[PDB]
Write a protein that binds this ligand. Structure first.
Ligand SMILES: OC[C@H]1O[C@@H](O)[C@H](O)[C@@H](O)[C@@H]1O
Ligand SMILES: [K+]
Length: 886
């Protein structure tokens, strides 16, 4: 397709030429054409093999979770909420213009619930979602019991050394290590059948009700409402933010002022992104809410099937080592043959149940994904003298200082594997949050349930709204979240978490997508998928997005000062958006296959994912000292960091340039603040351009293997505005972009020109391109250097003067270099090219008409079409006469 598809609104897609003009009648209500009702909106769209695949979801959708029976998750079929999300394949049925017709329609059904799964879902609890306005202090949660309070009691670290052997804690130096955080204050935690509030606590260390749902609605909700009342009032906001409009902006659904139940929000968020292969449609969730499931649709699915989603809790990833998997699985909750009705994901042999998915794409017949591990830990829901009551069980898993430095060794270090170990330690006359070693034998970690309460205790599963496991308001949590934990060695290597701020990526083969479909369709007990072409990576938020961190008074989440420039009030929770794959246009040594990669934005930088196209694997190298070479992180400068990542609108890739274009649109900002103040900086847009860097695979015998990861560079391109409403950005070429925007209520075309890496508006080219006189393409004027340069034809007297009269028309016509001498071209931009096309008119004469490059690098002439429609640009023709018939 010689066209650009532009989503004009939530229902309509219009086809645009490279001249930034709409193809007449191309505008299509794809919702109406999918035979869906007006409550449906376009979530995402992609081209595969010339057909258009669109993901729809409905603002009317209602889902319920019933703890008993066994079709536990269903749509609310009463009223009008039986509104599943749909993928639709459209094909263009005309050779002239655009007429979308529906080919195939696929319903995304609610997930199956096994007996085993439903025992976990029963007491599953989920944090209220993170917004734009969530503060470091909002996330902060009350520090839980120490490891020795849980095990021994109110009863002294004098008896810590005598006793740690009777509680499986041999040689453990960390009696004062935290066992997690309290669920009586903080961000609201709610079951699948409950609703999140519109209120966020300013200090979650004091003002939340956490999971104390019943406390919230009888006591604290009234307080929050009087403090933080929705705009018509104006309130004090001493204690609570009100983020209703910010919740709406991230796809939270509402019955008036009340958010719909969690299961509804999960389903609605879960149908956000699609990708398409020869055999499959894959649907995944957005970067804003955790998702617990994803669809694998078989494109052959009969004309009307219910395509079942696969649980992530049934989807085993390779985390890079078996050990990196154990760290995640051990902190999911208490496993035990001995305990009763104590059901969590770990105890029921499930794996990591939730991700904050960056996006999904396809290259060749492979699916590529990335996301953040959503924090998931056990909590103690006991009712009576249980010490950890109403407490989440979570702990830093950050590698000790003594660890073998060399990635393999850093990430497989035993520190905090089975339970708590870090807090604070003064070695010599200096200090560390990290345990200084990994004596009388090997150091032991144990799960913070004391031996006696082993058979009585109720440890259930929760899911956090961010990539942090541990919200506890201690020093280590800040250092875990911000990447500040360093060894004291030679080359001073950074010590990673493997539970907090963990990024996940992979490539998924068609067989691997087939097992997921088989897991989703499992009768009875849960079937499992293994995805083996996957990795994880400790990816903290840049420490320089915070201020005033003490060391040389220890700062925790409740006092940590955000200066985060990227649209988030918080400086501790990482975020990712716009994963996108592309084939490298740069040739490879022959007998090897084309290179491909993907990129994704995270807070403070771009990540490059590197694949080996030989066998559609993660790129790797033989040495385990150097870090999985499938991942590279390049930090942003100030200009990239100033971009509000919550305004991400779309990402395209151009195979000719080998460049990614990330579009940001400020109209996506919410109407109002957490203080209910109208947001006024919602005008404008921004483009970030991503390019590959480093030595790429298979250039020459030398680079058949690599021991340095290819990476990417994100550059705020110069294409931005604080004044215009965006309609679209057309990346015509590496040298040019067209922006369609409105100042008033009509669409204006701006041409941005790339000057040595920086895009600048070119007002003369803009005026040339915009002067199309209501046609599809820029006008042509003889006397003007316009979008088409300027052509001056030689006079007819050049034939006689050059003794070309002694040549025939047929000779001249088969000598392109003679007929390049019948004009002088002035280019409008450097290296714009032009040739003359010749036509015999008689035995003695011919005409010539120019063929001229536009900004896209394509040649146009009298016969040019877009979508089969003649452009009728207005190129001249010139007769030359007096040639011989020899
Ligand atoms: O158990 C920890 C203790 O080890 C002993 O050898 C020292 O007396 C203390 O300085 C230290 O706090
Ligand atoms: K011209």
């Amino acid at each position: 397709a010689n066209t650009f598809l532009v989503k004009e609104d939530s229902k309509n897609v219009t086809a645009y030429t490279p001249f930034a003009t709409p193809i007449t009648d191309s505008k299509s209500d794809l919702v109406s054409l999918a035979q869906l009702d007006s409550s449906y909106q376009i979530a995402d769209q992609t081209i595969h093999n010339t057909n258009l695949f669109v993901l729809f979801k409905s603002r009317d959708v209602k889902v319920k979770y019933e703890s008993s029976g066994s079709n536990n998750i269903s749509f609310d079929s009463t009223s009008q909420g039986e509104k599943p999300s749909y993928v639709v394949e459209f094909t263009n049925s005309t050779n002239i213009g655009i007429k979308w017709t529906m080919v195939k329609k696929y319903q995304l059904d609610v997930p199956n619930v096994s007996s085993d799964m439903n025992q976990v879902l029963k007491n599953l609890i989920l944090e209220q979602p993170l917004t734009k306005y969530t503060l470091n202090s909002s996330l902060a949660k009350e520090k839980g019991k120490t490891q020795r309070e849980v095990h021994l009691g109110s009863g002294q670290a004098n008896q810590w050394t005598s006793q740690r052997n009777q509680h499986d804690l041999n040689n453990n130096p960390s009696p004062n290590a935290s066992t997690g955080f309290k669920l009586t204050t903080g961000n609201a935690y709610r079951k699948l059948s409950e609703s999140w509030p519109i209120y966020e606590p300013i200090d979650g260390t004091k003002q939340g009700k956490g999971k104390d749902s019943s406390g919230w609605s009888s006591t604290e909700e009234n307080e929050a409402k009087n403090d933080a009342p929705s705009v018509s009032s104006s309130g004090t906001f001493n204690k609570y933010l009100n983020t209703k409009q910010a919740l709406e902006s991230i796809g939270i659904l509402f019955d008036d002022q009340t958010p719909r139940n969690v299961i509804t929000q999960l389903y609605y968020a879960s149908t956000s992104k699609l990708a398409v292969t020869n055999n499959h449609i894959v649907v995944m969730g957005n970067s804003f809410l955790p998702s617990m499931w994803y669809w694998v649709v078989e494109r052959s699915a009969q004309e009307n099937a219910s395509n079942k989603p696969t649980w992530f809790a049934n989807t085993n990833l390779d985390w890079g080592e078996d050990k990196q998997k154990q760290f995640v699985e051990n902190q999911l909750g208490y496993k035990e043959t001995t305990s009763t009705n104590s059901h969590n994901f770990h105890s029921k042999s499930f794996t990591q149940p939730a991700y904050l998915i960056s996006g999904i794409d396809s290259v060749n017949d492979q699916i590529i994904f990335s996301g953040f591990k959503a924090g998931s830990v056990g909590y103690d829901s006991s009712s009576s003298s249980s010490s950890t009551k109403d407490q989440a069980l979570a702990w830093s898993t950050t590698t000790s200082l003594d660890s073998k430095t060399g990635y393999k060794d850093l990430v497989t270090n035993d520190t905090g594997l089975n339970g708590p170990i870090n807090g604070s330690f003064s070695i010599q006359d200096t200090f560390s949050f990290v345990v200084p070693y990994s004596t009388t034998g090997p150091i032991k970690t144990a799960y913070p349930v004391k031996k006696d309460q082993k058979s009585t205790v109720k440890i259930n599963s929760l899911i956090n709204a961010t990539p942090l496991n541990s919200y506890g308001d201690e020093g280590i949590g800040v250092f875990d979240a911000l990447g500040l934990n360093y060894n004291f060695k030679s080359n001073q290597e950074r010590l990673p978490s493997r539970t907090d701020q963990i990024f996940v990526y992979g490539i998924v083969s068609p067989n691997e997508l087939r097992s997921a479909k088989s897991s989703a369709d499992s009768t009875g007990s849960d079937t499992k998928v293994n995805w083996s072409n996957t990795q994880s990576r400790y990816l903290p938020v840049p420490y320089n997005y915070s201020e005033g961190i003490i060391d040389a008074s220890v700062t925790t989440f409740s006092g940590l000062k955000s200066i985060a420039p990227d649209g988030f009030a918080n400086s501790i929770a990482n975020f990712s958006v716009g994963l996108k794959a592309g084939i490298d246009p740069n040739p490879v040594m022959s007998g090897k296959k084309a290179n491909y990669g993907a990129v994704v934005l995270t807070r403070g930088g771009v990540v490059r994912l590197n694949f080996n196209p030989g066998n559609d694997s993660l790129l790797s190298t033989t040495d385990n000292n150097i870090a999985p070479i499938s991942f590279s992180f390049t930090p942003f400068t100030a200009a990239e960091s100033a971009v509000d990542l919550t305004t991400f609108k779309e990402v395209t890739y151009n195979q000719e340039s080998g460049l990614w274009s990330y579009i940001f649109d400020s109209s996506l900002k919410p109407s109002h603040d957490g203080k209910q103040t109208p947001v006024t900086d919602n005008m404008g847009f921004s483009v970030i351009t991503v390019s590959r860097t480093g030595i790429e695979l298979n250039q020459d015998q030398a680079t058949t293997t690599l021991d340095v990861a290819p990476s990417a560079l994100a550059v705020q391109s110069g294409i931005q505005s604080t004044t215009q409403t965006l309609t679209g950005v057309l990346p015509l070429s590496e040298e040019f972009s067209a922006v369609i925007a409105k100042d008033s209520d009509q669409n204006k075309i701006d041409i941005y020109k790339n000057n040595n890496g920086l895009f600048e508006i070119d007002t003369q080219l803009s005026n040339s391109v915009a002067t199309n006189n209501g046609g599809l393409a820029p006008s042509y004027t003889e006397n003007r250097v316009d979008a088409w340069g300027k052509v001056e034809f030689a006079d007819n007297s050049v034939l006689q003067a050059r003794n070309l009269v002694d040549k025939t028309v047929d000779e001249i016509i088969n000598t392109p270099e003679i007929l390049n001498s019948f004009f002088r071209f002035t280019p409008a931009f450097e290296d714009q090219k032009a040739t003359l096309v010749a036509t015999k008119q008689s035995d003695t004469s011919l005409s010539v008409s120019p063929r001229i490059q536009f900004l896209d690098g394509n040649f146009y002439d009298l016969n040019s079409t877009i979508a089969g429609v003649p452009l009728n640009i207005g190129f001249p023709s010139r007769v030359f006469a007096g040639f011989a018939a020899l």
